[PDB]
């Protein structure tokens, strides 16, 4: 869809394509976090530290519970197509309607959670499942260290150690709970997603994306000191005929001035569609981008025509900083503005001259065996695959002040035109 | 002031109003933080850890002291209206003049602080006041645990524990001191504002705002290892005849295209004033917004007239992303662009058709008992309170490139007009 060859002549470089994997559906699993560990010691040791630790957790559990309880409600309360509920008074956007429908879907789950928590209260396992998974904050450290310490050291000796261990956990909890992403909880409990949920070898990119999806707090229990979250696990599917391209713009020469074509960082082609992509929220893998939804957006017709090979329509702006590159390697050769950048062919002993009417010089292995950029001699790649007077008239400005100054000039010319019309009507 | 009813026809939705509480005045109280705890043990235990801890605090106390000492001075040194001081050479903006006047007001307080610190050096209370309040970093943990450990365990055993406890406190200090907000200090010392200052049942929103106000370091003592801050406690007052409204724009249909009215997230009405509000720095309560100063700002006359009911002046822009909602619940009914969104009345069995000349469909309980959005059947609210050919000509673009491309077209038309004028003057 993109004329990669012609764009090089205007300094627009298109990188290697990558497909797209989109999260069409999500598996929903509930994670219960129990913040109070169980000290199995029959001598009731550590109870004083746990009492103090409870007082410290309140600084987090109470704010969360208050925020949830006072959250506005947009739907108030079967068949495959029955009415979900009644529209609550107020204004609710599509995002709030979708989020509320998700909370309604969890109504049946909440009734189950209330029964499972009773068994979590007296269990001493670090990670337990009945899927619904429950993790105790420090139960693993307690069982492996604090439990055997009581049999060897005094209760006082390792009682203080339990205090410091719990204090560290509070510092981590307040870091993540003080939105929430699954990576935060996974790091807090130092446990992998594959160890938490036994559901399905997948690439590191897929796990990194799963750890990036947000989690929402469905309820908080002030009596058992437990917090439960809804975790969404994505089902990635490759979107056929979808390509994401990276666009890099180099400096372009026009009458000894430096210009560049302003384009989005990433552009996408999907069948007949051509436009930018907001990959800032996506994960980039070796061969595809993993996104939560289609990142495409509609571009200006001049940019869409520019990328379709009509390079005379490409917008151009003056280069005002050193951020814009002046040379780049392309398919085994060098593409650079050889006027402001010293380009040498087959050695530094000779400089290739770029005529003032040419904006970008394309150097290929068929011409120069070695290319030197600012003295950096490089060997061309033999496997690389890298006379038209192109003129670009769509000059554009990226700042509102420049446009305003130009608009004031246009308004002044309009006044002169109106005055000349008045003069013509009066004299004629 | 706002014609909420007419704005719905253009897709502009105004949410439930909230008043405004503004901080007209502030109470000033000084907080002294003493970083070195006092170990009451007569055997001088823990002294080695304290010596090491002092060396670690220098990495924070010295940078702060150097920054304060080298800070530029804009005022150099009674009666109810005497001269504050002499203007120092240089340039000082209003913010710096105000901040400097605040430091001058603290001159008398600093003279008092220098005498109070002497008593703080030998006291062993965690929180003490003489108002001026002083808090010792770990004195509470030392008295409740490290002091009784010496009587039971050896000095070596719990000496190492004191080291780890102090090390944790340093990691927290460098997190907040490495501006500063009172919430940070409150979290660092795990103490509530009501426990620190005994001054006045107030709502959680008021305390959350008090914890949001910034605190400034007035002085640092390198000998006693103490830092003192000036804390401002706000006196909230309800600003009568002040309302803040939330504005949500949905997609609007024009000849099968999707348009939306770009408006600020929040708009304010204050007597005769109508304009946007920068609530990003404010706290949102159940019935009012708590702000440090009036967040209002002047809007463009076209937006001010649009919100005043002259919907023909509303600016409109093309929808270029899925962020802009396409349906929203309003006062118990559904307001949606039923062309791109499937709207069903009294069941999915029939779709309501929206004529191409109508931009937004308003569905009320008086017409459809149940409304289905993309198959999501919802029951209308019986208590809800939800034929004009409106045309919007003020098309606007939100990006500088589009405006530049349109401006280039206008300039080309100006050149053609000037040429036609030249031709007319030459021929006639």
């Amino acid at each position: 869809q993109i004329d990669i060859t012609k764009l090089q002549h205007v300094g627009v470089l298109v990188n290697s394509p990558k497909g797209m994997k989109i999260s069409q559906n999500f598996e929903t699993r509930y994670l219960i976090l129990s913040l109070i560990p169980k000290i199995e010691d029959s001598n009731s040791c550590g109870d004083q530290q746990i009492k103090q630790y409870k007082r410290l957790l309140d600084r987090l559990i109470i704010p969360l519970y208050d925020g949830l309880r006072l959250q506005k409600d947009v739907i108030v309360t079967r068949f495959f197509g029955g009415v979900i509920g009644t529209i609550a008074l107020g204004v609710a956007t599509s995002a709030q309607i979708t989020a509320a429908v998700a909370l309604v879907e969890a109504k049946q789950a909440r009734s189950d959670i209330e029964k499972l928590k009773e068994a979590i209260r007296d269990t001493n396992k670090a990670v337990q499942s009945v899927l619904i998974v429950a993790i105790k904050s420090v139960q693993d450290y307690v069982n492996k260290e604090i439990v055997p310490c009581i049999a060897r050291l005094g209760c006082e000796a390792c009682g203080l150690l339990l205090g410091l261990a719990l204090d560290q956990h509070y510092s981590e909890l307040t870091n993540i709970f003080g939105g929430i992403k699954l990576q935060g909880i996974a790091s807090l409990y130092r446990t992998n997603i594959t160890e938490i949920f036994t559901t399905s070898k997948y690439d590191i990119y897929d796990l990194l994306f799963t750890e990036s999806i947000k989690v929402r707090v469905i309820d908080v229990d002030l009596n058992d000191y437990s917090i439960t979250l809804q975790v969404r696990l994505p089902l990635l599917t490759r979107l056929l005929n979808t390509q994401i391209y990276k666009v890099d713009s180099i400096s372009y020469n026009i009458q000894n001035r430096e210009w560049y074509i302003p384009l989005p960082s990433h552009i996408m082609t999907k069948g007949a569609f051509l436009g930018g992509a907001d990959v800032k929220e996506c994960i980039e893998a070796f061969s595809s981008y993993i996104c939560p939804s289609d990142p495409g957006f509609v571009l200006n017709h001049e940019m869409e025509s520019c990328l379709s090979g009509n390079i005379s329509q490409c917008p151009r702006t003056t280069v005002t900083s050193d951020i814009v590159p002046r040379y780049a390697f392309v398919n085994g050769g060098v593409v650079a503005n050889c006027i402001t950048t010293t380009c040498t062919c087959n050695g530094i002993g000779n400089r290739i001259n770029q005529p003032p009417d040419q904006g970008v010089k394309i150097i290929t292995h068929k011409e120069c065996n070695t290319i030197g950029i600012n003295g950096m001699l490089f060997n061309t790649n033999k496997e690389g695959t890298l006379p038209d007077d192109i003129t670009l008239n769509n000059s554009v400005a990226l700042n509102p002040i420049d446009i305003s100054i130009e608009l004031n000039k246009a308004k002044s010319d309009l006044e002169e035109s109106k005055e000349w019309i008045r003069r013509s009507n009066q004299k004629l | 002031q706002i014609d909420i009813t007419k704005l719905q026809h253009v897709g502009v939705l105004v949410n439930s109003p909230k008043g405004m509480k503004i901080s007209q005045n502030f109470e000033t109280r000084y907080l002294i933080l003493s970083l070195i705890p006092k170990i009451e043990d007569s055997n001088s235990c823990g002294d080695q850890q304290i010596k090491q801890y002092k060396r670690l605090l220098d990495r924070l106390i010295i940078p702060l002291y150097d920054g304060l000492r080298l800070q530029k001075d804009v005022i150099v040194t009674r009666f109810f209206g005497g001269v504050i001081g002499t203007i120092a050479l240089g340039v000082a903006t209003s913010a710096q003049i105000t901040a400097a006047v605040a430091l001058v007001e603290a001159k008398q307080a600093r003279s008092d602080i220098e005498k109070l610190k002497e008593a703080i050096r030998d006291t062993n209370k965690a929180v003490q006041s003489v108002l001026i309040v002083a808090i010792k970093s770990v004195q509470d943990y030392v008295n409740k645990e490290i002091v009784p450990c010496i009587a039971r365990l050896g000095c070596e055993a719990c000496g190492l524990l004191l080291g780890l406890a102090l090390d944790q406190h340093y990691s927290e200090l460098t997190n907040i001191f490495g501006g500063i907000k009172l919430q940070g200090i409150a979290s660092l010392y795990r103490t509530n504002i009501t426990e620190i200052f005994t001054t006045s049942k107030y709502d959680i929103y008021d305390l959350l705002f008090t914890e949001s106000i910034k605190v400034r370091v007035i002085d640092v003592d390198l000998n006693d290892y103490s830092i003192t801050l000036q804390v401002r406690l706000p006196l909230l007052t309800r600003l009568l005849n002040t309302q803040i409204y939330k504005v949500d724009s949905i997609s609007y249909n024009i000849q099968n295209r999707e348009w939306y009215i770009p408006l600020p997230s929040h708009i304010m009405t204050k007597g005769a004033f109508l304009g946007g509000a920068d609530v990003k720095e404010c706290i949102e309560a159940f019935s009012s917004y708590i702000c440090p100063s009036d967040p209002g700002f002047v809007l463009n006359h076209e937006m001010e007239s649009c919100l005043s009911g002259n919907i023909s002046q509303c600016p409109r822009t093309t929808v270029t992303s899925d962020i802009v909602p396409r349906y929203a619940f309003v006062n118990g009914g559904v307001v949606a662009n039923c062309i791109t969104t499937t709207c069903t009345c009294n069941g999915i069995g029939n779709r309501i058709n929206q004529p191409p000349d109508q931009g937004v469909k308003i569905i009320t309980h008086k017409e459809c008992n149940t409304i289905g959005i993309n198959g999501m059947l919802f029951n209308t609210n019986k208590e809800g309170t939800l034929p004009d050919d409106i045309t919007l000509n003020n098309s606007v673009a939100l990006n500088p490139i589009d405006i530049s491309i349109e401006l280039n077209k206008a300039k080309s038309d100006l050149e053609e007009s000037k040429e036609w004028i030249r031709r007319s003057n030459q021929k006639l």
Partner: nanobody
Amino acid sequence: EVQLVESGGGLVQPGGSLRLSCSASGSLSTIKALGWYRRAPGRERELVASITSAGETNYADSAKGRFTVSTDNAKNTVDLRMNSLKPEDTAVYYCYAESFVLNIYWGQGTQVTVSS
């Protein structure tokens, strides 16, 4: 949570017919579509059929004009009628429920085999 119970699988002679049923229970008012998926030994799961609450029905490339699906809202059942089976149709079929918020739920799965 939507619990799905499948039934009707087993062995069938080539060219015969089979009826697969899936019973759903839960907050079905939130489920957007109900359908069937297939996994074959050595490949991932693929869509077979799905029916929306409005009765709109779509099929796979291999199921177009060959299979049918139906629902009964009153007795809350999902039925799959299998006709003109081929030796390549032996696989494991699953019934699924898709929510308006893109949540998907799977049943226990039933194996369908066809004689050579």
